[PDB]
Amino acid sequence: VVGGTDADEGEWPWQVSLHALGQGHICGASLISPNWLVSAAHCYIDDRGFRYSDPTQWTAFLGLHDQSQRSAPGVQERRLKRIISHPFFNDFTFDYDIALLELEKPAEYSSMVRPICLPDASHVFPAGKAIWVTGWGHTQYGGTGALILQKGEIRVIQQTTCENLLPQQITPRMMCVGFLSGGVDSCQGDAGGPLSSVEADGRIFQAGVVSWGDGCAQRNKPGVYTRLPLFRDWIKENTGV
């Protein structure tokens, strides 16, 4: 996250860190039930040197605050039994950039570990709404990755504006969230984490999955996120949640 601040400890108890063994923190995820996380499909694509698609390569940390303190009280360590990437995921366009991760053992709910709420398929996150992005990604483009979880407040951008800012790149699964002026944005290593939206009684719903951007925090280049409501039924079908 560029332009953000240190989160308070336990502030985002649905934010999860995914480490690939020997590679450190690679992406974020969100806790949605005792057994399931939502993340970004593009995080789990093999390259010639590492099989990111193999669930056995991964560790999820729940209740994590500081990457240098992974054994701190209340942090829960879990393996993955399965990665379900969206069948329509495209590694060139990043369309359908969403995956479901099955924990090998259930999370224990606590003050530090709590699921985010899922929005119904009919819910619209309106243009202009303030939303929060969180993660341990870079704090400057080409920069480096934060030890302490970062938070930044960003706003939903109108889809037509989004399409025009990033021509031939924005599908209806995608949403721009940020500022046309730049300044606050997700960045490398934030991929897969949740957008957190404060809803009508203060409960927090997931409004998206961190996906991609052109640089970070640049003018006219807000971050791109996978939308959540359109995947509500897909989530239910595949997880029971």
Ligand SMILES: *SC[C@H](NC(=O)CC[C@H](N)C(=O)O)C(=O)NCC(=O)O
């Ligand atoms: S909608 C998901 C979260 N709800 C809960 O954690 C309460 C029910 C639990 N499933 C349980 O302990 O049984 C939630 O409200 N998260 C968002 C928030 O703002 O806290």
